[PDB]
């Protein structure tokens with residue numbers, strides 16, 4: 505079996521290998537990349553996402569989110585308080601202000617220490633989940649706005665034609681902005697490209713061990729767990745690496761820098777934080793290997809997680825028994 509210790513693998517495709525996205529994902533899995541839950545893909549040196557980022561300041565972040573924490577330093581939840589709209593230019597200036605800028609630090613490890621020590625005491629503002637793309641339309645390779653759609657994948661594998669569309673999202677981050685422990689909707693893959701700015705640190709639990717993380721989470725967030733049998737779908741819980749180690753949860757960590765892609769694999773729980781002002785783009789995608797995970801994916805029916813239009817059809821077709829109760833949650 506390849507990659508039996510479930511390490512995060514890093515790939516350096518040639519320009520030729522960068523042509524066929526599906527085939528390269530399947531190559532990475534042939535080498536065991538998926539066992540980690542997360543892989544890093546460094547593009548060939550000939551590739552670019554677009555010519556420059558000099559003209560992005562006028563993108564609007566309609567609903568910036570202030571991420572307010574509650575709990576203890578290593579075990580906390582965050583809620584998102586909606587703020588007034590601002591442009592990317594305004595946001596970048598806010599991220600660089602004394603109140604929000606990255607502190608002096610030695611290296612990524614020192615900054616990681618400072619994050620876990622101090623995150624809870626601040627409420628950074630995240631421009632998350634903004635529909636759009638920063639890939640040039642002329643970028644033909646690994647263009648996250650030109651991938652094969654999940655609806656088309658389901659049709660190709662299972663023969664059923666369904667409604668729905670699949671588009672990318674932009675994420676504008678600042679120091680301490682945080683993504684909570686989650687898998688993707690319907691345990692899809694995701695791909696994330698760090699277009700610009702400061703890094704993003706990732707933590708991940710191998711898919712084969714995801715239920716270990718879930719069990720810990722139910723212990724650490726006991727009222728959340730009573731309220732909903734899939735509360736990590738709410739995307740509000742954080743657990744530090746120290747806490748994971750104390751509880752014997754298998755995980756790995758890696759820092760993504762600008763210019764790099766990360767791929768999360770089905771049922772690969774992940775969480776992380778941004779080091780400073782940055783912009784990432786991400787999208788969900790599927791492969792044939794996903795179908796079995798989509799059929800088994802947990803679902804939030806308490807009503808909190810409230811997800812896209814396009815998830816309806818996935819639930820309807822892959823999880824018809826759940827469908828009724830799940831949609832009661834959506835309505």
Ligand SMILES: O=C(O)CNC(=O)C(=O)O
Nearest residue numbers: 675683694695696784786
């Ligand atoms: O970058 C972020 O804030 C979160 N991204 C993801 O969870 C992802 O790409 O799957």
Ligand SMILES: [Mg+2]
Nearest residue numbers: 560561562563
């Ligand atoms: Mg602009």
Ligand code: NI
Nearest residue numbers: 687688694768
């Ligand atoms: Ni994700």
Ligand SMILES: [Zn+2]
Nearest residue numbers: 732804806808
């Ligand atoms: Zn729920």
